[model samples]
Target: HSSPRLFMLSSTSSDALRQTARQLATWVEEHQDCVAASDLAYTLARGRAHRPVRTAVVAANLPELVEGLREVADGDALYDAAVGHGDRGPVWVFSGQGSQWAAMGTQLLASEPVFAATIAKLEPVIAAESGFSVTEAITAQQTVTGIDKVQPAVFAVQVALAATMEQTYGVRPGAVVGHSMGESAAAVVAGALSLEDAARVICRRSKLMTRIAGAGAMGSVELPAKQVNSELMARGIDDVVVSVVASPQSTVIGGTSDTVRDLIARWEQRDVMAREVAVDVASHSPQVDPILDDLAAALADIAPMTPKVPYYSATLFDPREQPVCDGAYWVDNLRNTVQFAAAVQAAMEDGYRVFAELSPHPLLTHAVEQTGRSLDMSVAALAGMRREQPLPHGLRGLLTELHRAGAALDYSALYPAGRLVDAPLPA
Candidate 1:
């Protein structure tokens, strides 16, 4: 009963999680809608961190949401989330450009109002600033994988995710962090930078980074920093540096193409999985130093503003100094090592247990968990959604994770206004 650390609630018990589903199911049965269901999903996440026997579901509406919850509560989740309807269409999966299917625009064009609304609104804003059509990029049969296209394509999804979560569901992140380019969208969401400012910054940043081309070989390896260091020394390879501390077990190292790829191959020889961190160039490394001058000049006039919500800087974490997205900030954001692990540590130390990654793909789950493990504590980390999945699938997973973590989601907004009702019962 007397734990030193602060959390919304204690470690999730199996019974507690089942009880949670029952409660949410009951709530949805009584107070039903997309909005209330969404809120309640996050609301329940704060207290229950994780359990092996937990159940997750994706529903088309409140009925399905309740049906899946009841199945899980009843412990007969035989068929899982999908029904044996029609076979799902081909899924076009990309590493970072954010997935796009052959026919993605057909159904969703008239499906979710918020998604369609966001895309329509962003259609012009992105084109005017980025000089590329956001509408075409998302709906393309074969989207380009160039950094020029990849960067902004991912950014659009970031903003759209933020828009849907904040505007539609009344969800607000107590604090926010963005992964590399995603930070631009965070600055926009956090109110640190205007939409126009971010637009110019992101579009220009992508263009500049694109022109320079490959920054040698950057690879993410599944190993802790210490072990990674020892492994490198054992192989007599010391030129590369750990550019990104993504998680306790994941380290992104960068160096000259030859040197970096050699280590990558050596790891492959040992059956240790490793892959390139990006297609264009290595970020958060010395390779990015060459562009600092131009990057500074490119982003010099982007007006800097204070974020309404707490903004964590992955480039540098200062418990005392908040991040300022000035010319210097953007430059350092590219040049310095991405201290994602340190930033997570700082957030955890500050009693921020709940984390939700806002991106088309859930890239940082392992990173957050590894950081939490490094500290020998459990913190709840979730991703907003994935690209090309059913909208509800992403939403339900996000909500379930947050709910399991015990987030006190603002479900009050889901309620009808309180009023005096004069009801005469017919006896």
Candidate 2:
């Protein structure tokens, strides 16, 4: 390798560039082991650090220039060595409404037995509470849009997926956080609530939400919380309240249906972006006051504990303050603003750099990413699954990114029993 010389590889078509890059990469991969380590590092570093050379490589469709250097330099030990240096930990962000989709977990349920068994275990508990099977809800056999069905259905999937990631992928969370309805599942994952109790609470919580359906609505305004609050006051919009500070530029507002629509229009007139959420019930707003006492009474007997993993509340308590995540705290969770951006900032301050949003799809990932970016911090925001791809592939992509970011993974745990076989490599 003549000092790994860079050639002016040109192509008019994007596909041509992509094809050439793959061919070049394959050639490099084939010959890399024979190249001296210092020479390889010098070659790869020069190719990446020089703008023209790097652009030519990337334009030719090669990705991860520096990552490629790591590959040739360290091989399998790259990630293992990297894991030993980070002071940060992973934080699992459980999602709320608007992320659920029909047949969300069908692929995973069919392909991964551990993930499937988890859903199977929770099926009876959810069915017993709601007189419906969560399996059907997740696979789209039954309608999953109603809060009565969606909450518990979402809870089942969220908790099962979280368990799958930990038990199957060996990606145990260092901390957990939740947004609105997602909190119930987060509590269970953190061991703050028993699975059965969490299911019961979710079933009852959804039932209460159903009662207020059509009475109010929720909207997302493209403004900071302070700005949104000021705008509401200026417009005399007393009924609307900021429900969640999702990011530096996104605040969710909730109130009576009329007020929500009116506020959205006013925001648009001022060149501010705003849109209504898809829920009929306005959660995290005063519209939920009617169910406060009922909710408290329903959950009064449940027990809570210090989380087996650190838990952050996007509602009643800030994880920075390290508040007790008890029954009383959960009660307040239903009525308070989800200070998601604040809680995420707090978690980052506490040294959480990898945020895995454990949901069927990534609904709040943008918010998490935006929040981290606003703080000028380099963080990894990942999802448990994506709706656009097969569940197993989506999961694999997520794990790959996490692993690349220095989180250790037990590959053995991901395969079923007897799936692993001895495949001898060429000598």
Candidate 3:
């Protein structure tokens, strides 16, 4: 192996991994590891030091990158490390919906080793367990649907990606909150849901949802609930109802799409703000009572585990908020109103200055921003809290930037150094 060989790798393409790994293996076996730095490699590795990457184009500048690396090598290394090492008081607030893009995860899927390895592990396991090729499923445009498969698969990918980034970067939340489906993922991460239990529940839930779609009502309306329901009542839209209460003014109504559309059209004619939802079915309303029984029954089969951290449940059954219990709670969770908007308000009233929404999208964050502004609180939202391809490469540089902003947050002091650490496994 040459002493100063450069390895050009594309984060996305998996075709060259076998060849890349073989080359890496040969190189590692043939040469001694010597640490060196260069400008081009600097941005690729540690990032540009003490310089303003005012734009994505700035970060892409080869000359500027080279200069930054040169400066790091010649200047204070410890200062650079400690720059963003303290507590930056900014809170992380995640978004839900409207945030899921066609290729939103392209970067992370290609860049993360843990996520990549997990997917590699999942492919064969999926085939063996579910009798389907995960390799084909993930790479496919229309992935097959099964709670036993899709739920575990999506949750696994999202959780794996989130866990990898949180572990690598010193990111922590003063408080964590999630919306709807994403809440399950948040529960797992926040210690509310154990890894095994979460996997089992999500798998079961996905299966249940897959087996049933139109047993109830679910839709979205820009109009206030009272106004919409009154209009629907006048039209005698029975057996049709709203399921979820998402934003304060926005309610997610779930019934038959046709019925929901009628109500939406009524609202539209009245010129009251209204729109239809593009979901498979409605959720979080009384109309899903029939499905709730089976959902609960399946949940009963799984044993309950104590949460490792604090968590909140959004069941509309109880006017007062409470912690989620067994399958019964979860079954009720399936059919009951979301009450998520109330949950957020309660959290804020309880002095939860920081809220992190671990949804697949940022819908919740924007909702909070809208409501929070009326309250005139100094709250901020942290969307994409889990970057699929995180910033370890440019972590030091990002830390510097945060430090410059005086928003350098400290997570290390949460515990004694090394006491709270999960040591890397022996290579």
Candidate 4:
């Protein structure tokens, strides 16, 4: 992927920029074209900047940089340039576990209505699936991690934000990609399955895997799967399958509880720092293969639909190129490894220049960075979509800028950080 091209104006006129932003927002709403909205939003965001905007900054240093920048002469102009005038791309990405934290995208949700609507739609579905209400999960000391809750909540939130991004900026990806559990949402965004159906499958998958894993646990191995598998075999340890291949050096392993425990023990004895994930299911391994027939039947009942745009699967059919959605491929993915590293490499070769990770975790950013691909731009679904930031003004201002950046307003961007109209039930 090529470096993102950013355009900045040196003119210091906040009023002019604000006016331009409003104009751009209006234009996007009227046209419903993402390209047009993004183009206009840029025009509005940088109204006119006399200073150059930053690009390709490392993630770790962004916070310090944001704080350390010398005060600019034009406050409004600075906001515009920071939010809008840059090498931004419209591509969005969604991720799975280890990326989520409490109060994840709640702040941003305040200012973006599509985000709220997506959550609203999600809450009921999640409640239905998990037998918990949405209101308690997000607010009243509940969790989305339950078999039924997390899958639906995560999928709904991701889809809502993606949908919001499309409505606001008229930006849509040429392809949709997901990592691990996130593939469920990717399927929906790619227009492969309805959200309802996708939720059902995810819940069933989690439930079944949890049932099978029993005392078995899932853990990620930073060492190469081939080497680890070989090492285990040489040591006479079997009962494990590679789950997800995050990078060439990193893979997730799953199997019987005792096998998982022994593998971790052996790895630790060898000084390998294996981390156990929060999930109980042994997904993407033979352990979960018992449910294959049911899963296939679930998917078979509803034929995979052609995506409105290109879509890729996490467990790839071949490592030579970007993933082409294949039912057989997904089935194979269920019992084998998630060739994520290979899929990403192929995505890059296929011309995925701009990558954005959806809500919860920003794992994809790290993986993509490890791939050494120069990401044109990246975003967190809730981080960028909602209104959580420094102050009352920070989030609101950011959302306004986002709107100017081609974020659509199916729902007004007005929101309060402290409150969500209807939250999910507690766990």
Candidate 5:
């Protein structure tokens, strides 16, 4: 079932929705022969789905007039236009868990051959480490919630989606950045690590995380690191630690439940924004210190090379100057606070004007947008997929945005089997 969060029209009344869809259908029919068949369908589908409408109407009535309208409507949502004069492929930013959900990659797996093949190739490697089938977990919509499955599952989906993007649109990334477990997948996409090695690192990391599951929790506070740290120190809130600096005003803190509750209370009293993260295990904090050495050991044989695309580190001291993202770096990435804000700034400094969040959904899209705004940089943020959206539709939506942003795209790649055809005008 598609969630309301997935669509902009979710809040509309039923009567209004019917009217909107009917009006859109009329517009699509009137313009169907006025523009290129592909462009007309793409534009109308996206405009209708995003504004306010029902899937039932789109799938039934909309498609009867414009075949494949449902796919377009389900896939694309509007994004902020490219703001500056400079144009380039967006820096692909990968997000870790908290963006995941069961059945995330199921539709893509069936609809996209590139995505399916990539996941198929990596499933065996993941299964060996987690002692469970990655394919079954995500496809069956069961056990994917577990870290053991979700970690590698996210890795597989992220990379496969990237592969599909390249295959479909020729939309190669200008650079890549990953948050937490996402970094491992980013490393793969950047060519820093082979798929096999990336899978190994994620599998091992998740295996170790199982030992600490349910031991702690995480919360996001709308406060600067300096202020959060100062207040925590002053209050002797030793248990709570700043885990991620997502933006100037947004930081994720993690600790045992009691400590997190106490910090939330303090922040509430001060009228600061604070809310719990949807994670049971406290990551990017001292809670993982005990297993740091083990993580490094697990990835000791990790063979990192200079990335083909520029790779930004979310936890490194100088993420921009990167010749090394080795086992030691993974160790620090696991135990230390993630400097996500700094990493995004680094990408922006390098002239990245677009941020493409390559996750199952738009977890880091807002954070990247906020970071770009804070730095007064003209950047556009996009997501590959959204929860409750059909995967094929979400992908097309991203491609549409990328095309509008003036990024070079090979539309031919979208129909690998060459099913696309130009039709005669409606007579």
Candidate 6:
């Protein structure tokens, strides 16, 4: 057996793993009676350190551990160990509709008990609030495309993703930030609102948007907010404005459909990257005004808590101006600009270096990276569950990155009976 040992292995493909594990097996057999599962688990995660492809195996005993390595070597899956990024928690960035896809949580539903359990818990709450079955909606296999359906679905998925992050991967958000409709989920994650209350808020808010949807539109422009605003002013554009200050180099302009299309066309003609944001109602624009009173009234009985975890508000970027996430504030959240850039910038300026978007797809990662560039800082922009993959697999990918970045991970879960976890699982 080679001297380096075999908790983690990396190579170009699974083929390398078979031969890779031959030596690993001999070493495991020799150490069968000698090594501590705790130490092995800890070492496997630190191996999350690098290479294009890698696998970390964790088991309470030698044969099982060796089996997992062998299984992975045979192109099978075994996430016996997750890089349980302990308290260097990544800030969970929740985004709205654009990040969703058809049947996003379907595979995850089959594979992840934590995700399925959370959705099951949220099912009745969402139904009671909106007379809609969130569980059915998630498994419907149909694309989420409407204002009422997509928003609530996105909200449900985000919250479920939050739960999975904590309960499954043993990672909690050090902070939370929500962009637009993502706020309800964020508030729930931050402990600023009860799950039931947040579900109520999300259902009603999305339902009301159905009233004013289809009359407005939003488009993302590659231009910076200042440049976008200056151009809007120079063109004397009245209805459209920078609805989302996504980052220093990304802005979303929202207004009437025709005008927004015109901008998209014009920007494309200018060879700048610009595209439509798939929202029937242009959030953070005047289009949401009519629903504000209804949204507030629907949420009037809402109660909010001082967040258990710090929540960075994209609606109110300034810390001093941030309000309790009550009904009234949610109304303001819809009507006001999504100062997302400011919120992320503030989070970074305050020393947060990791941003992980909790979504089916990543919509803000590029903006997050660009924002880091503008701040002259380095940061990790991670994404949650992605389409076409099982939930656990995607989560393992996220944890792998967090592990690579040196987040302190909890691997005791990987060992039986929480063995030797008194000291932190040093990466």
| 170-242: candidate 2 lDDT, tens digit per residue | 7777888888888898888888888888888898778887788887889988899998898889888888899
C-alpha lDDT of all candidate models, in order: 0.61, 0.69, 0.48, 0.53, 0.72, 0.75
TM-score, per-candidate, Cα-based = 0.74, 0.77, 0.65, 0.67, 0.78, 0.82
Worst 10 residues of 3 by lDDT: 418-427
Ranking by TM-score: 6, 5, 2, 1, 4, 3
Q: Per-residue alpha-carbon lDDT of model 4 for 1-427, expressed as tens digits?
A: 1222222222234554434334433433444432332232233233322232321111122222222222122225443333223333333567775554455545545756666676777666666655665545544333456555565556666776677666654455556677766777787787877777666666655555555645456887778768877877787866777777776667788777778877787777888878776665677666666777766665554446666655656665664434434445446656767777766666666655445666654566666655533334432222333212232222333333333443223222231012221111111
Q: Per-residue alpha-carbon lDDT of model 3 for 100-128, expressed as tens digits?
A: 43233344456556556655655554454
| Backbone collision tally, model 2 | 0
Question: Cα deviation in Å at residue 312, candidate 2?
Answer: 1.6
Residue range 1-427, candidate 1, lDDT tens digits = 1111111111134555556667667766776733444334334332233333345555556677777777766773332111101111100111133333333443344544665777777677668766788767766777546777667767766676666665554456666766667678777877878866877777777778776687676888988777887877877876677877777678888877888888888888899888765546766667766777887888878888877876666766672257788878878777776766666777677666667776665777767777777887766656665555665322434544454454544433322233322211111
Model 6 regions more than 4 Å off? 1-29, 33-39, 42-87, 319-322, 392-394, 416-427
Candidate whose TM-score is highest? 6
The whole-model C-alpha lDDT of candidate 2 against the native structure comes to 0.69
Q: TM-score of the candidate numbered 1?
A: 0.74
Winner by lDDT between candidate 6 and candidate 4: 6
Per-residue error for 159 in candidate 4, Å, reads: 1.4
- Sequence-dependent TM-score of model 2: 0.77
lDDT of 1 at 257: 83
lDDT of 3 at 139: 42
Question: Which ten contiguous residues of candidate 2 have the minimum total lDDT?
Answer: 50-59
Residue 55 in candidate 2, Cα distance off native in Å: 19
The C-alpha RMSD of each candidate to the native structure, in angstroms, is 9.8, 9.4, 11.5, 11.8, 7.6, 6.2
